[PDB]
Amino acid sequence: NVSLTAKGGGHYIEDQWDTQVVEAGVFDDWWVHVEAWNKFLDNLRGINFSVASSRSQVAEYLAALDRDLPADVDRRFAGARGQIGSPNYLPAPKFFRLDKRTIAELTRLSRLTDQPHNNRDIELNRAKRTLRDVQPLKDSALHYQYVLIDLQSARLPVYTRKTFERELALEWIIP
Amino acid sequence: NVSLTAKGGGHYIEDQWDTQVVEAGVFDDWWVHVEAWNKFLDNLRGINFSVASSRSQVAEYLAALDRDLPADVDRRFAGARGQIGSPNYLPAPKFFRLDKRTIAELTRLSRLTDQPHNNRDIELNRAKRTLRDVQPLKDSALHYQYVLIDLQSARLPVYTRKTFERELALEWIIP
Amino acid sequence: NVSLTAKGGGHYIEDQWDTQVVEAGVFDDWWVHVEAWNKFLDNLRGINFSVASSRSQVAEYLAALDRDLPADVDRRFAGARGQIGSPNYLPAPKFFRLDKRTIAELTRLSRLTDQPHNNRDIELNRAKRTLRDVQPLKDSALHYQYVLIDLQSARLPVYTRKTFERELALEWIIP
Amino acid sequence: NVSLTAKGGGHYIEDQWDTQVVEAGVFDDWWVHVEAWNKFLDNLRGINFSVASSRSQVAEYLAALDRDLPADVDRRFAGARGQIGSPNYLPAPKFFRLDKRTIAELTRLSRLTDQPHNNRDIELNRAKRTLRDVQPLKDSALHYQYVLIDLQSARLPVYTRKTFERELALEWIIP
Amino acid sequence: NVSLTAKGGGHYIEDQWDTQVVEAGVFDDWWVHVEAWNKFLDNLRGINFSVASSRSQVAEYLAALDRDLPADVDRRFAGARGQIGSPNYLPAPKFFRLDKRTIAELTRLSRLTDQPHNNRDIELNRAKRTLRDVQPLKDSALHYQYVLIDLQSARLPVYTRKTFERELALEWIIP
Amino acid sequence: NVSLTAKGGGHYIEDQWDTQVVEAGVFDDWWVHVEAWNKFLDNLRGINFSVASSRSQVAEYLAALDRDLPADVDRRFAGARGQIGSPNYLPAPKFFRLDKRTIAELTRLSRLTDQPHNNRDIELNRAKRTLRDVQPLKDSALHYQYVLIDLQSARLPVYTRKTFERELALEWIIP
Amino acid sequence: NVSLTAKGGGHYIEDQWDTQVVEAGVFDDWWVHVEAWNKFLDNLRGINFSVASSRSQVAEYLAALDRDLPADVDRRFAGARGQIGSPNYLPAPKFFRLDKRTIAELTRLSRLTDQPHNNRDIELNRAKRTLRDVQPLKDSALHYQYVLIDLQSARLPVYTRKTFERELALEWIIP
Amino acid sequence: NVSLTAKGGGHYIEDQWDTQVVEAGVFDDWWVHVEAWNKFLDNLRGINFSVASSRSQVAEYLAALDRDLPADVDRRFAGARGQIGSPNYLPAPKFFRLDKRTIAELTRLSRLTDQPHNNRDIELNRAKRTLRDVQPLKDSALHYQYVLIDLQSARLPVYTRKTFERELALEWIIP
Amino acid sequence: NVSLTAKGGGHYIEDQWDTQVVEAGVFDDWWVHVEAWNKFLDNLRGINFSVASSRSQVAEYLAALDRDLPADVDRRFAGARGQIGSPNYLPAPKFFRLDKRTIAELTRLSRLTDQPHNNRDIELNRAKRTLRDVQPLKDSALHYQYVLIDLQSARLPVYTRKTFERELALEWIIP
Amino acid sequence: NVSLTAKGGGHYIEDQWDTQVVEAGVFDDWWVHVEAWNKFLDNLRGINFSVASSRSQVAEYLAALDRDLPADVDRRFAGARGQIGSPNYLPAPKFFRLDKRTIAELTRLSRLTDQPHNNRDIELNRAKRTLRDVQPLKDSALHYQYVLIDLQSARLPVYTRKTFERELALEWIIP
Amino acid sequence: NVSLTAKGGGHYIEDQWDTQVVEAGVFDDWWVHVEAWNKFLDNLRGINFSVASSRSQVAEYLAALDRDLPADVDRRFAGARGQIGSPNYLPAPKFFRLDKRTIAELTRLSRLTDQPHNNRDIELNRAKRTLRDVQPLKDSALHYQYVLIDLQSARLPVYTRKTFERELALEWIIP
């Protein structure tokens, strides 16, 4: 994934594939599915700071919210299945383009949540024989509040075939 | 959800769908059902600061008060079922448009309620062998009073088909 | 590896192989497979600082994310198998050229994660008969946040036969 | 080793062998096989500082990554076996010339890793009846980070027969 | 946004678009919606000086009170929907032209509210172990009173199609 | 980027490319996309002085608000896609020419925000065992208010093909 | 590098090579690739003064932004690959000539960033048992602001074959 | 070294060898290889002042950047191997003549970096039981900035056989 | 601006444009819009002497009360839109011609308001550890009263097309 | 710049170029663009005396308000693009000839603004442990008022092709 | 440099070279390139008096604004490349003859900027434990204003081949 639409027909002319595709803004850069991005966001919403394994989640969800381009010549940009006006339509496949800027920020959260910590004092005097402290946690907790805000705030460009097609002058051969 | 009105007929001309719909102010931005927003608000009313799990609620309710556009071409904007003047009417489906501004604020509550804390001292000296303290809790408690006030105060635009139809020049083909 | 495409046909004229290949920017310098680089990156994402063996991973993954040129005369630069427009295509073999600059940085992480440490006090008083401390860990933890950011941020040149062929004037004899 | 190509034919004219070979830059100076150097480098990558026997490795690997000239008259400089364009080719034998400068640096690592230490306090109070300390280890740990960086960074001259032959005006008699 | 009226018909002749539109007083300069400006103003009214996050608001509201021209050829200047004298009218779309002068002033507030401050003494002696001071805050507080007054005082030109059309000799082709 | 419009057709006659393009005012000098410049500006609006990482943003955003000429022969100056009067138009690609003067000023902000500072006293007496001070921060804070004002104030020339074409006598061959 | 265009054809007549090439303004003097210079500049933009290893970068980047003449007879001045008007063009190889003046200035930054410092007091009283000070750092910090400004400000001559060929009367023999 | 070109043929007439070679400006005076000088320079670039062993480098690199005349009768001045216009060319062997003036300056750096120092106080009170000081280091640090600048600034004469041959009327007998 | 009336028709015969327009009393000399001049005047009315930023206003308002000729051939002198006697008329565009004399006086105010001052004593003894004095301020305060009086007093010539047309024998070609 | 109009056609007869152009009043003497001069003037208007960096501006703006002759044979004197009476006209390119007298005066401002000063007493007693004084600043402040007045007052000759052509008997060959 | 035009053809008859060239007004006397002199002048414009290293610039720029005769027999006086009327022309190479008078004056600035000074009191009481003074600086600051004025004021003779050829009866043999 984002996988989806399959090999067949063929093909992006590929005279333009490299001139305009692998050259930049592709592979180098993420694509995040919408209605897939929206629930991730609340996944981060969405976390207590901190008990471990409530921070182990940030680190993980960045992986497995699968984040790659919807097409490879041969294969088509993710598209609509079926005609309009009918019970089987299920048309809208959607994609958020993530700026280089965003990703760098996204990893920022990725290691917002990691702090080198003593917790391994619960075990020596508590299970055998004082208090834990949080200022490192908390100035990361609030840093978090801010880094997260901008991700929701800033709009990211939506893409589709009507659009990824117009957007870069690339077209899909019939035969 | 907001789900509801189903695939059939068809369809928003879709000549204008992207020009005027996915382009902005849609997907990017929330829709909250009224008479669904109203009880959420009291859900937040509505919380003691703090015993945990009375703050775990804020975080959750932001999810599952389901918050998305009432239509996708193919499908129609949420509408009235039945004719006027009759026992089966049940006409009014209503929607609050949430500003980009609001959501950012809404997450503000989302991590108003999270504070990195020591509570895990109840366990070592209390269950085995001093006092808890609240200033971090309380300046979040009052911050809360203020962030919440504006959500009730500020009116948010109500939408309906008579209105979402006029609002953006988009129309629903008969056949 | 990167291994792959096999001995046969022959061959890069080899009149130019040394003039333009072993001379520099080859052997001396890494090649990292794409869609192979992308998951490594999240491998590093991706680590807690620290419990050992969560830092033993950085050190290892630098090895075994195999990182060498896709060709040796005799053998061809990694290429596409099959014709366009058909079920068996599987065309895109991709490669990130790693700057001399990057590698030096990459090892920087390699011994970001190594710190000479006391941990071997858990054993004497804890298992027989005080607290661990983290400032060395943490100023490496944050150093980490920064060294890692640039690896994602900075774009690295993508290469392919249409491209590694044009890029250096080297060509593959038919017979 | 580097051993390899065997006695036969004969021979470097040996009128020039001493004028241009044993005189300097030969025997005096190392040769390191490529694709043999590359894995050593990660061998050093590649080490924790410190638990002993994770430092005993540096000392050893400098030996046994065998590091000597590919030829002695009688015998030829390491070369290609077989013709081009065929399944049995296996052509590329490669060599890094190591500067006098490098070796001196290489031993620098060799006794970066050796420190006179107390560790033999684990045994008296721990096994019979306080804490270990690391500043000597750690300012060697970081010294290490730097000494190692330059080894990867700096390119070292690649050599081959097309090249070791041109490089010094020495040639191999037919009969 | 200001978004609104949609692509269709076409179009500003565009023979005059650049002569009289992108040339100056457009893009370069803001447009603020009325009845959208009016509530912003009270947003600033409207702030206590100071507790942080009561100054974080000024900075934000300048963004997201969306402030751009109501038209782009192709699209029409924001207009009236429906005929006069009827239940669906909702006619008046209104716009404040903001002088170059105003914006520069508007940012003046933007960093009226930012002061480099010590507040991070509450944490060391108050949460661990004297008084805060306000003269920098207060001579910004009063500076504020004055900078804000002129924004309300000075009238800014209202615009509409009957007017933006007459105002610059630009007209909208029928077909 | 600014990337965009792709290789094809061809080409700027290139008899004039160097006489009038690489010679000066090109490569040497920035181009900033409009509606891309406008949000950057508020990005700077827009910052508190100071907590670090609220100043780390200035430094970054200067990079990645991508700032280069819209064309290279072969490729065309960024242009309009589609005919006038139709749902797919999306015509206006816009560009701010940045004076040599501006850039020098722009870097001025770039290291307005950097000050050599003691902050690393929070750690010794606060986390182990007095007040921070701001005059260096604040006379940079206000310096900032002024350097930023002129960037918004001063109009910068807008460019387009109707215009970059007339502006320098350069034209695009049909075949 | 700048490496690139390869041995073949031949050759600069070399009757003029020394009269007009090695004699001066060549080898003696740097060449910096454009679109390679542009990102370096922001590399320096671009640095905090100071935490070490944020100053270790200046020193390094001067090396490895590779800075040498695009040609050696035999080999051609870096040139365009392919014909005009076609998908494979990738024509523009560009070069900034660096004045003797610039380089001397460039090293000025090189040891702007180096200051003999006490930092090695963090370790004795902070890790075992007062404040750090910055005036040396800061009058280097501001010195920096100025030395850097001129590098962006001053235009440096762009070169190409159409130009390096005309510039010195040197020409490339066909056979 | 500079070693290189080998005994054979013979010979500089040697009627003129002493009249014009050993007499002066030879043996007495250094020769530094170019493209060998260029990387040394950045070697010095290139150093932090100070932690020891970052100053031990200056002292060393003056040795082992090997610095002697390219010829001894019998042997030829370093020359080109192969004909022009062909894949094996590798023609340019280059040499910087170092003035008596330069060398004296070069040693100036050689003991710029040496200062008699107390550092051996880290060991008595720090490892057993105050602050280090830098004014001697720093007025050597800046002295350094200046001594180094002139080495890059001042051009040094390039030499080659076409040139070392013309330069002193010395010629190489055929038989 | 004064911008306004647009390119079209054409044109001032331009046989007389230079004889009678650019020659003098045009470009050289200001034009100030009436009903635009009138509010500026009260802008200056209108200022307290002194607290800074109440004097920063004089300096600014001289800029941005935009002050240039209403026409350039091609374009017409600012004129009336629509016929007499009707709801849309909005006829009167008006202009004050500013004498060379006035402008020189106007700048007089421009640096009436600037005085080199000590104010930066509030900061050393007031914020850390006597009185400010005003005679320089006040003899500028009263100087001000007088310089300002004459600007209101002296009438300046009003201009319009009925008048700028008669005033210089210049006329606007029909076709 | 003033750059602009490009090489083509050709050419000033150049029989008269030197007799009447390079001989005097050209190169020797400045040309300042109008509508480029006008905003510079207010740039100087326009400055407070003094806080540094409000005087650093005078010095800079003299550079970069680019000030050179509009033509070099081959190239034409800056001219009008397009025919009269049409939407694309943009005719008027204008130039102020600066007397030798003016420039000398202009530099007068250039080092009106520079005064050798003590300011570097803020740092010793204010940041560690009396009043600043202004008479040198102020008699430069008022000197300024006067030197600036004459620049606005005195009219400077406007030039154009209809005029630079008549002005010196120089003409532009057709072929 | 001024270097440029290369050896070839030949030659100034050299019967007249010494009679009329090396005899006087040549070698003895400077030549400064125009459009190279013009930016130097602003380089000096252009300096604050004083902080050191803002005076170190004067001293340097006198060197490296390279200042020597455009020709040596054999080589031609700097000339035009290409024919008139064509895209490649780039004709005008220009030169200011500097009087003996000027140079002596030019060095006057050279040690206008050098004053023996105490600054090395910042270090003893300021960094360990009164005010700096400027009268020596300032009467050099103003002396500067005057010495600099005449350099701009006084016109210096422009030279070219049409002119350096006529100027001294020297001519360039064809064969």
Q: Give the separation between CA F87 and CA B19, rounded to whole angstroms.
A: 6
Q: Give the separation between CA B59 and CA B52, rounded to whole angstroms.
A: 11
Q: Give the separation between CA A95 and CA A164, rounded to whole angstroms.
A: 10
Strands K158-159 and K95-97: antiparallel
Strands C158-159 and K31-33: unpaired
Strands J158-159 and K31-33: unpaired
Tokens of H17: 């060898």
Q: Give the separation between CA B48 and CA B62, rounded to whole angstroms.
A: 17
In the sheet that G158-159 helps form, which strands lie side by side, from edge to edge? G31-33, G95-97, G158-159
Q: Is the peptide bond before D74 cis (omega within 30 degrees of 0)?
A: yes
One-letter amino acid of H6: A
Interface of G with F (CB under 8 A): 34-35, 38, 42, 45-50, 84-87, 89, 91-92, 94, 122, 125-126, 131-134, 137-138, 140-141, 144-145, 148-149, 152-153, 155-156, 158, 160, 162-163
Q: Give the separation between CA F105 and CA J41, rounded to whole angstroms.
A: 19
F74, F78, F81, F93: which is closest to F9 by C-alpha? F74
Burial-class residue I35 by CB neighbours within 10 Å (0-12, 13-18, 19+).
exposed
The phi and psi torsions of J107 (rounded to 5 degrees) equal: -65, -25
The residue of J58, J86, J88 whose CB has the most chain I CBs within 10 angstroms, and thus the best one to mutate to test that interface, is J86
Distance from CA of H100 to the nearest CA of C (A): 35
Are G64 and C99 an interchain contact pair (Cβ–Cβ within 8 Å)?
yes
Residue G61: CB atoms within 10 A of its CB come to 17
Reduce the DSSP state of residue F57 to 3 states and report it. Answer: helix
Given resolution (angstroms): 4.1
G99, I85, I118: which is closest to K63 by C-alpha? G99
Are D143 and H53 an interchain contact pair (Cβ–Cβ within 8 Å)?
yes
Q: Give the separation between CA B93 and CA B78, rounded to whole angstroms.
A: 6
Are C7 and D87 an interchain contact pair (Cβ–Cβ within 8 Å)?
yes
Distance from CA of G147 to the nearest CA of F (A): 12
Distance from CA of F36 to the nearest CA of B (A): 16
Q: Which residue has the tokens 């046969």?
A: C8
Are J88 and F20 an interchain contact pair (Cβ–Cβ within 8 Å)?
no
The residue of D54, D58, D84, D128 whose CB has the most chain C CBs within 10 angstroms, and thus the best one to mutate to test that interface, is D84
A116, A95, A84: which is closest to A165 by C-alpha? A95
Tokens of A136: 């490192």
Chain C residues inside the 8 Å CB shell of A100 = 153, 155
Cross-strand partners of E96: E32, E158
Contact D65, D39 (CB under 8 A): no
Q: Give the separation between CA B160 and CA C136, rounded to whole angstroms.
A: 60
Helix and strand numbers (H, E) in chain J are: 6, 3
Q: Check the CA dihedral E108-E113-E118-E124 and report its sign.
A: negative
Instruction: Determine the residue of chain K that is closest to F14 in CA distance.
Output: K87
Length of chain B: 175
Q: Which residue has the tokens 């050179």?
A: J68
| Half-sphere exposure of residue E7: CA atoms within 13 angstroms, side-chain side | 22
Sequence-distant (6+) residues with CB within 8 A of I62 are I106, I107, I109, I110, J42, J45
Report how this structure was experimentally obtained: cryo-EM
Chain D residues inside the 8 Å CB shell of C23 = 158
One-letter amino acid of D90: L
State CA B151 to chain mean position distance.
Answer: 11
End-to-end, the C-alpha distance of chain H in Å comes to: 26
SS3 labels along F89-101: CCCCCCEEECCHH
State CA G104 to chain mean position distance.
Answer: 12
Chain J residues inside the 8 Å CB shell of I123 = 126
Q: Is the peptide bond before K11 cis (omega within 30 degrees of 0)?
A: yes
Contact G156, G121 (CB under 8 A): no
DSSP assignment letter at H44? S
Q: Give the separation between CA A73 and CA A80, rounded to whole angstroms.
A: 18
Tokens of D143: 């010294």
Cross-strand partners of I159: I95
Q: Give the separation between CA C108 and CA D45, rounded to whole angstroms.
A: 10
Tokens of I135: 């005679």
Distance from CA of J151 to the nearest CA of I (A): 9
Sequence-distant (6+) residues with CB within 8 A of E71 are E5, E12, E77, E78, E164
Strands B95-97 and B158-159: antiparallel
Are G101 and K64 an interchain contact pair (Cβ–Cβ within 8 Å)?
yes
Contact J73, K56 (CB under 8 A): no
Are E114 and F48 an interchain contact pair (Cβ–Cβ within 8 Å)?
yes
One-letter amino acid of A37: W
Tokens of C61: 């993954």
Distance (Å) of CA J173 to CA J8, J11, J74, K85? 11, 5, 10, 9
Q: Is the peptide bond before I143 cis (omega within 30 degrees of 0)?
A: no
End-to-end, the C-alpha distance of chain A in Å comes to: 26
| Cα-only R_g, chain C | 22
Q: Give the separation between CA A73 and CA A17, rounded to whole angstroms.
A: 8
**C135-153 helix and C100-110 helix, angle to the nearest 10 degrees:** 150
Are G46 and F59 an interchain contact pair (Cβ–Cβ within 8 Å)?
yes
Q: Give the separation between CA I82 and CA K147, rounded to whole angstroms.
A: 63
Tokens of G174: 């066909």
Contact D13, D170 (CB under 8 A): yes
Distance (Å) of CA H22 to CA H27, H163, H172? 7, 18, 16
Are F88 and B16 an interchain contact pair (Cβ–Cβ within 8 Å)?
no
Tokens of H146: 């200046």
Counting CB pairs under 8 A, whether chains E and I reach 3 or more, is yes
Chain G residues inside the 8 Å CB shell of A15 = 87
Tokens of E150: 């002129």
Helix (H) or strand (E) holding H95: strand H95-97
Interface of G with A (CB under 8 A): 87-88
Residue A83: CB atoms within 10 A of its CB come to 12
Long-range residue pairs from G157-160, CB within 8 A, at least 24 positions apart, any chain: G157/G96, G157/G97, G158/F22, G158/F23, G158/F27, G158/F28, G158/G34, G158/G94, G158/G95, G158/G96, G158/G97, G159/G31, G159/G94, G159/G95, G159/G96, G159/G97, G160/F18, G160/F22, G160/G77, G160/G92, G160/G93, G160/G94, G160/G95
Q: Which residue has the tokens 């062929």?
A: C165
Q: Give the separation between CA D68 and CA C24, rounded to whole angstroms.
A: 22
One-letter amino acid of I120: R
Instruction: Determine the residue of chain G that is closest to A17 in CA distance.
Output: G87
State CA D3 to chain mean position distance.
Answer: 15
Q: Check the CA dihedral E164-E166-E169-E172 and report its sign.
A: positive
End-to-end, the C-alpha distance of chain F in Å comes to: 26
Distance (Å) of CA D113 to CA C55, C110, D59, D60, D144? 20, 17, 8, 11, 8
> Per residue in G71-95, is it b (16+ CB within 10 Å) or e — as a string?
bbbbbbbbbbeeebbebebbbbbbb
B123, B143, B122, B140: which is closest to B131 by C-alpha? B122
Contact G11, H87 (CB under 8 A): no
B85, B82, B71, B84: which is closest to B159 by C-alpha? B71
Q: Give the separation between CA F106 and CA F111, rounded to whole angstroms.
A: 9
Burial-class residue G169 by CB neighbours within 10 Å (0-12, 13-18, 19+).
middle
Chain G residues inside the 8 Å CB shell of F104 = 149, 152-153
* Partner residue opposite F50 with nearest CB, options E110, E116, E136: E116
Chain G residues inside the 8 Å CB shell of K3 = 24-25
End-to-end, the C-alpha distance of chain C in Å comes to: 26
* Partner residue opposite A141 with nearest CB, options B11, B114, B123: B114
Q: Give the separation between CA I145 and CA I47, rounded to whole angstroms.
A: 11
Give start and end residues of each alpha helix (H) in chain I.
17, 37-43, 56-61, 100-110, 135-153, 161-167
Give start and end residues of each alpha helix (H) in I83-134.
100-110
One-letter amino acid of D158: V
Length of chain H: 175
Q: Give the separation between CA C151 and CA C154, rounded to whole angstroms.
A: 6
Sequence-distant (6+) residues with CB within 8 A of J168 are J20, J21
Reduce the DSSP state of residue E48 to 3 states and report it. Answer: coil
Q: Give the separation between CA J69 and CA J3, rounded to whole angstroms.
A: 8
DSSP assignment letter at D45? S
DSSP assignment letter at F96? E
Q: Give the separation between CA A171 and CA A169, rounded to whole angstroms.
A: 7
Interface of I with E (CB under 8 A): 1, 3, 5-8, 53, 60, 64, 81-82, 88, 90, 127
State CA E137 to chain mean position distance.
Answer: 25
**DSSP calls for B58-69:** HHHHTSSS----
B91, B94, B77: which is closest to B170 by C-alpha? B77
Strands H95-97 and D95-97: unpaired
Long-range residue pairs from K55-59, CB within 8 A, at least 24 positions apart, any chain: K55/K113, K55/K114, K58/K109, K58/K110, K58/K112, K58/K113, K59/K110, K59/K113, K59/K114
Are H88 and C19 an interchain contact pair (Cβ–Cβ within 8 Å)?
yes
**DSSP calls for chain C:** ----SPS-S--B-SSSHIIIIISSSSSSS-EEETTTHHHHHHHSS---TTSTTSSHHHHHHTSSS----S--TTSPPS---S-TTSSS------EEEPPHHHHHHHHHHHTTS------TTIIIIIS-------HHHHHHHHHHHHHHHHHHHS---EE-HHHHHHHTT--B---
D131, C141, F128: which is closest to G127 by C-alpha? F128
Counting CB pairs under 8 A, whether chains E and F reach 3 or more, is yes
F35, F59, F159: which is closest to F115 by C-alpha? F59
Contact K26, K159 (CB under 8 A): no
Instruction: Determine the residue of chain C that is closest to A29 in CA distance.
Output: C155
Contact I147, I109 (CB under 8 A): yes
The dihedral region occupied by A153, where left means phi > 0, alpha psi between -120 and 50, and beta the remainder, is alpha
Neighbouring chains of G at 3+ CB pairs under 8 Å are A, C, F, H, K
| Cα-only R_g, chain B | 22
* Partner residue opposite A25 with nearest CB, options F3, F64, F81: F3
Counting CB pairs under 8 A, whether chains A and F reach 3 or more, is yes
Chain C residues inside the 8 Å CB shell of G3 = 24-25
Sequence-distant (6+) residues with CB within 8 A of D72 are none
Instruction: Determine the residue of chain F that is closest to K89 in CA distance.
Output: F19
Q: Which residue has the tokens 């929070």?
A: F122
Reduce the DSSP state of residue F3 to 3 states and report it. Answer: coil
**DSSP calls for chain K:** ----SPS-S--B-SSSHIIIIISSSSSSS-EEETTTHHHHHHHSS---TTSTTSSHHHHHHTSSS----S--TTSPPS---S-TTSSS------EEEPPHHHHHHHHHHHTTS------TTIIIIIS-------HHHHHHHHHHHHHHHHHHHS---EE-HHHHHHHTT--B---
Q: Which residue has the tokens 């920020």?
A: A105
State CA D66 to chain mean position distance.
Answer: 6
> Per residue in E26-36, is it b (16+ CB within 10 Å) or e — as a string?
bbbbbbbbeeb
Counting CB pairs under 8 A, whether chains K and A reach 3 or more, is no
Q: Give the separation between CA K129 and CA K127, rounded to whole angstroms.
A: 7
Tokens of K43: 């380089």
**J135-153 helix and J100-110 helix, angle to the nearest 10 degrees:** 150
Q: Give the separation between CA K24 and CA B67, rounded to whole angstroms.
A: 90
Residue F144: CB atoms within 10 A of its CB come to 24
Contact G28, H32 (CB under 8 A): no
Q: Give the separation between CA C158 and CA C155, rounded to whole angstroms.
A: 9
